[model samples]
Each structure stands twice: as C-alpha cells, then as structure tokens.
Target chain A: VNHTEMENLRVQLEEAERRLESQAPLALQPLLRRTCENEMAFLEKQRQDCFKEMKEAIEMVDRLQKKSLKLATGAASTSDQVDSKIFALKSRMEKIHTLTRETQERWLQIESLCGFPLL
Target chain B: NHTEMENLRVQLEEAERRLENGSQAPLALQPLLRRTCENEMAFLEKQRQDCFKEMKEAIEMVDRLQKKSLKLATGAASTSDQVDSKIFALKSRMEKIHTLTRETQERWLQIESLCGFPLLY
Candidate 1:
C-alpha cells in the first residue's frame, strides 16, 4: 500500500530482465520457440486424437450402460428401439474389435515371417 | 522365383498365430482397453512399414554389392583373392541384415509377452 515500497519491486523486475538478456542468446529464442511450437502441435494433435477416441469409446459405454441397466430394470423395449440400439452398437464394436485384431495378428505374423531366414 | 516365393510363404506362415481366446476385461474397461489396442495397432503398422523399408534398403545394398563382387570375380577384373575377400565381407554384411530381422521379431515377442493380457485389437 506504500508508494515507497514500489521502487524495490520495480528494481527487482528490471534486474531480472537485464540478467536474462545478458546471460542468454536472445537470437536463439526463435529456434527454441519454433521447436516447441512444432512439439506443441504434435502434442495437441495427439491429445485431440485421444479425445476423439475417448469420446467414441465413452459413447459406446454410455449406450451399453443404458441398455443393460434398462434391460435389467425390465423396461419394456416398447417399440424395440432399446433392443435394436443395443445389438447394433454391440456388434459394431465386436466387428471393429475383431478387424483390428486380425490386422494386428497379420503384423505379428509378418514380424515372425521376416525372421525365418535368420533361423 | 519359386525359391523366393517359397521362402516368402514360409516366413508369412511363421509370422501368423491366433490367441484362441478373448479379452477378459470388465465391461467398462473393455472399451478403454480396446482403444488402447487400436492405438497399438497403429503403432505396429508404422513399425511394419518402417521395418520393411529398412529391410529392403539393407537387402538392396547387399544385392548391389554382391553383383559387383560377382562381376569382379567372374571377369578377372580383380585378383581372385581380392575378389574372395570382398565376397566374404559382403556375406558378413548380409548376415548383419538378417540379424536385424531377428532383432525386430524379438522386440515383437517382448511386446507380446509384456502385455499381460490379450490385446483386443
């Protein structure tokens, strides 16, 4: 609250800035900046990719949870919408899961296949 | 061509296997686990592409050098002993490339074993 106290804080800030400039290569700042900006882009892309995936997965879970809980509660399917949505999501997940697995297995097989000449 | 095709097929079969079972993950965890496996599959695909690329480069290097060595040996372009030494060294280099394939497979095995449960992807 004292105007007299402001001088010390001002002096400290000036000293810090001066020391930073004197001790560092200011021209190199842009190199570091560019490097980090690219890194940030990659990191951001990766995070959003994860979020997109998570959202899809969570949506899948929410659907199933609703179905099973409703089914458990003996809620009549009424027009069978509930039952239909449940099976659709369920089988879609299974199909994709199986497709991914089959592809993964192919990767595994290729890995081993390439090594056969070594044995 | 037949020999190459046969070798390729043998390697193909060697690379493939089925787990014969499914993921035991709880329902909520199942989708999360599946997503992880999907990411892993993406990673594996990149590795596969890179491995094949590097293998081709390595093989091509050896093949080119092998042809050179044969030409020198066959046409009397170099002394037989000199040509022989070059051929021997090229064989060692080819063997080094072969070792890379084994190492890559070992890494794949390490992943499979270290993954405590079945990969749903």
Candidate 2:
C-alpha cells in the first residue's frame, strides 16, 4: 500500500475506535443502573427482614405488657418476675424503635443514591 | 528483491492494522455486557426500593398499633375505646399489608423485565 493508503487505513482505525468510545457510555449506563438496582434490592431485602423481626419483637412486647398490666391489677401478690418482664419488654421495645429509625435512614440514603424518592 | 521486500512490508502493515481492528471485538462486547448488567441492576434496584417502601409502611402500621395497645394497657384509654381503637388498628394493618404486597408484585414485574429473574417461585 502507498503512503496515502496507509493514512486512510489509519484514519479508518481511529474512526472505529472513536465510534466504539462514543458507544461505550450509552451501553454502560444501563449496566450501571442495573448494578445499582441489584444493590438496592439486596439492601431492601435486609431492611425488610429487619423490619419484620422488629415487628415481631414489638408484638411480643405488646402481649407481655398486656399480661403485666393484668397481673398488676389482679389480687395476686406482686412478683419480682413481673417487674423484670416489664423491664425486658421496655428495653426490647426501645431497641426496636432505634432499629426502625436507623433502617429508615438507610433507606433514605439508598433512595438518594438512586436519584429517586422513597414511598 | 527490493520491490518484493517493500510489497511485503506494506502487506505486513495492512495485516497489523486488521489484527488491531479484530482485537477490538472483545472490547466491544465488554460494553454490551456491562450495559446489560447495569440495566439488570437498575431494574433490581427499583424493585428493591419498592419492596423497601412497602416494608416501611407495614412496619409503621405495626408501630402505630403497638402505640395504641400500650396506651390502652396503661389505662390511658377505656376498654370500650380500646376496643374501637384496636379494631381500627387492625384494619389499618390489613390495608397496609395488602397495599405493600401489591406494590411488591409490581416491582417484581420490573425486575423480571430487565434481569429475567424470578421474584417468586
């Protein structure tokens, strides 16, 4: 090939690379979005499980609180056991509340990263 | 002999250029796959957000019920009032669960579209 032909081939190669470079971002956008979505799903699943456990914990507290209240109002002699149970229930409820708050903050962070608002 | 050498050099250069172009095939597929994966992940993230939001609502409803139950048990509310309050709380919880589940199903559809993954069995 002549010098002109070589130059033409070089230009063609450069043009192909340029086209590939231009196409890369467009192709990458969807993949990036998908990756973010997968991460969000994993986090969300964790949050859901946490919330479910918290709900169950709260329900247990509620039931125990009701039982303790009844025991307190009843004619039965005051038992140290009831007092301890109440304390335990209260502690767990507080923990659940804290967890709920923390999880909500995490959800907010994930939402901000996704450029979308949480429901 | 000199002419043959020059022709051979030209052929070698052309061959090199072709090789370079051909090597780009691997790089080209890289973006295509990356983009596909990203799209899948984005779809999954949307599904995740939907699920998260639903779980939040459900948990919030449960929290409200717990609060009312506490008030009732503490004598902050009368038994009759507590009955009505409990009924309302139960209703709210039921509704929240229903709505959240529906939203979760919608997110499942989105995930399926992008990743071809199953959300449920």
Candidate 3:
C-alpha cells in the first residue's frame, strides 16, 4: 500500500478503537461484549496478516522485478522483467483498509443505543 | 436483551465462518493469531458463570410457563373461553422464551466452536 492508503487505514483503525473504548460496553452486556471482542480480534488478525503479506510481496516483485536481461534479437538488447507491485500492495493494505473500515463502522452502529436487533 | 443476544450470535458466527473457509488467504502466523484467540477465551470464561446462570433461569421460566398453560387448559374440563385466552397468552410468552433459550444455546455453540478450533488453527 502507498503512504496515503496506509494513512487512511490508520485513521479508520484508530476510529474503531476509539468507539470500542470510549463508548462500548453499553447495555446488553453479555452479547455486545462478545461481539465487540470478536470484531476487534478479527481486525487485529487481518491487520497482521495483511502486513505480513505486504512484506512477502517484496518477494513477488523480486519475482518479476529481476534486474537482469533476457534479450533474444539479432541486434537488440533487453529490459527489466516488469510487474505491477501496486496490485500486490493493494491486496494487503488497501484490502485491509476496506475490511478495517467496515470493522470500525460496525462498532459505530453497535455503540448506538437504539441499534439493538429486532428479533 | 433478547434482541441484543441474537445480534451477538450472528456476529460471532460470521467470524467463525470466515475462519473455517478453505479459500481464505493464508495467514503468515496463524499460531500467533491463535494466541490472541486464546487470550479472548480466558476473558470470556469470566462471563461464563453469570451467563450460564441467566441462561438457566430464562429457560426455566419458559418451561414453567408452558406447564402452567397446560394446567389451565385442563382445569375447566375442556378450557373455557377465559382459560383458553389465558392459555394462548401463556403459550405465546412461552414460545418467545423458548426462542430466547435457542439463541442462548446457539451463542454457547459458537463459543464451543472456538474452543475446539485448536486443531484448525
């Protein structure tokens, strides 16, 4: 992920943590507590997974970003084995941003007093 | 309380399903993530005593109400209009409580699934 995407994800993740801390544990304690904890745990796990993937992505780029030559011409040269690292990058941080954004918004509703299930 | 309980059960199930899927992207350090999961299990156990207590009471209430409704039905040699309506009300209340019990059981099942996830993680 680029710097801007990482920043945006940080913002969303921080917001989720704020809601979870400052206003969670409202009424209906037993259920809400479990739900919120699970959400946090899942988000953290995803965050970790995405980060590790980003690191490993260096390998994929190293995979296609070879700085060598493979030219086959009667009088020509070669170029770098190019690949799009941005796509690989988005697979982690950007996807993580989206997932964590949802996680944050969920807490927003869950923190609301009237957001109880109708069942 | 019942509404909130149902909401929690659904949310937990969503996470469990995600973890169970075979197509999910590989996590680099599942053992580490599972460590986090283990800590949560301990935190939840604190609620275990109170949860089971309230669960038992709630279920017991529904059972008692059901028995009372049946008794009312049999009291009038066949159930008078007054007894019939009372039975209806009691049955309706009992049905709702039965539903609450179901949700409660489902929540516990979700908890059990996590406990048994040792192998999967």
Candidate 4:
C-alpha cells in the first residue's frame, strides 16, 4: 500500500531479472523458484485463514438475522389488523430470503474447490 | 558440436520467451513468477485490510442485535411501535451484513482472478 512495499517488489523483480539475464549458472533457478513458491504458499495460507474467519462471521450473522426476524415479527404482529402492512412485511421477509439464497449459492460455488480452493 | 551449441542457444531463447509470455504457465521463469507473486501478495494485503474493516462492522452489528434482543427480552415490550422500530433496525442490520459478505467474497474472487500462475505449491 506504500512506497516501501512497491519499492521492495521492484527491487526483487530487478534482482531476479538481472540474475536471469546474466550468464550465471542455471543451477540457481530452482532455488529462486522455490523461494518464490514458499512465499506464495505462505500468503495463500494466510488467505485461507482469513476466509475461514469471514465464513464463521457470516454464519453468525445469518443466525442472528433469522432470530431477529422471528422476534420482530412476533412482537409486531401480536400487537396487522393492517393486512396491507402484513403483505409488505411478508414481501420484505422474502427479500431477505432472496438475499440469503443468493449468498448461499456464492458460498457453495466457492466451497466446491475441493480443499485448496484457490488453485 | 558447434551446431549443437547453436541449437541449444536457440532453444534457450525460445524457452525464455515462453516463460516471459507465461501463457504456458507452470513453466514461467523464476524471476517473472516472483514478480507476479509479489504483486499478488501486495493485492492480498490491501484486500485483507478492506475485509478486516467489513468484518469488524459485522461484529459490531452482531453485538447491537444481541443487545437489542436482550433488551426486548428483559423489558415489558407490548408496544407495537417499539416492535416496529426494532424490526426496522434488524432489517437494516441484515442488509448491511449481506452487503458486507458479498463485497468480501467479490474481493477474494478478484484476488483469485489475479493469480496468473498455477500455484506451484
């Protein structure tokens, strides 16, 4: 996000490019490749962990949404002799259902990646 | 022997070009792959911060909803107006959560799309 990060990337790229373009022995390529792979794998693990946290948080939110919906309706209606109002409330409930369904499908597609989802 | 050296040199140049193009991925040269990975890591860092903010908002929303639920349970809530207000707040919270969740997923998808290499590890 800053110049330091940008500069670091540029430095690495420049160094790598220099080495590759040089007449240096080809033996070092594997080590360099492994170094890149190692960092990528580490970053990927971080990505997976972050995603897991997001998944857990989203699940919690979904549960809370359901509970609040029930509470709200029970509290409100126990008190729509207003049928029109009831219809609107039903429609709003359906909208929430729609949102949740779409979200669920997205999650399903993402989860279908067999374990290492990012590959 | 001279012809063999020329042939190998040509092959090496062609290999280098292929690696640079990266369309034949998993065969990319280390330098190019390293650059790609660094860019990806940078993007991930930015996205992680963005997602962290959204997650924090979600946590706060959860807390608010729980607080409202407890308040309703403990208090003598018979007023339709109070219930209606609570329902409105809950709707707002759910909408926010939905948006946050979708945005986070979209960002991750973007990150995945940016990954050019078939991850070597």
Q: A1-119, model 1: which lDDT tens digit per residue?
A: 75734543454455557656712222222222322233334334544554565566657666767852345465555336545555665665565556555544543343232221100
Fill in the DockQ of model 4.
0.02
Output the worst ten-in-a-row residue range by lDDT, candidate 2 chain B: B21-30
Q: Candidate 3 residues A2-111, lDDT tens each?
A: 86445445544665666567222212333434545665765676678667766776666665457544656665332222234445656667776886676566455444
Give me the candidate number with maximum TM-score: 3
Report lDDT per candidate: 0.43, 0.47, 0.47, 0.44
lDDT of 3 by residue, B1-117 (tens): 864454456445555766563222112212322333344454344335444565566566657656863554543554245445555665665566556545644554443343332
Count of backbone clashes for each model?
4, 11, 0, 0
DockQ, per-model, please? 0.01, 0.04, 0.01, 0.02
Query: Where does candidate 3 chain A have its weakest 10-residue lDDT segment?
Result: A22-31
- Score residue A10 of candidate 3 by CA lDDT: 55
Every model's TM-score on chain B = 0.35, 0.36, 0.29, 0.33
User: In candidate 3 chain B, what residue range of length 10 has the lowest lDDT sum?
Assistant: B22-31
Q: Tens-digit lDDT track for model 4 on A1-119?
A: 77645544554566567656712222223323333344445455554655565565556556545763365653434213344444554565555456445434433333232111111
What stretches of model 3 exceed 4 Å from their correct place? A1-27, A60-82, A114-119, B1-105, B108-121
True contacts kept of each: 0.00, 0.03, 0.00, 0.00
> Which parts of model 2 are misplaced by more than 4 Å?
A1-78, B1-103, B111-121
Quote the positional error of residue B95 for candidate 2 in Å: 9.4
Candidate 2, residue A115: Cα displacement in angstroms equals: 1.3
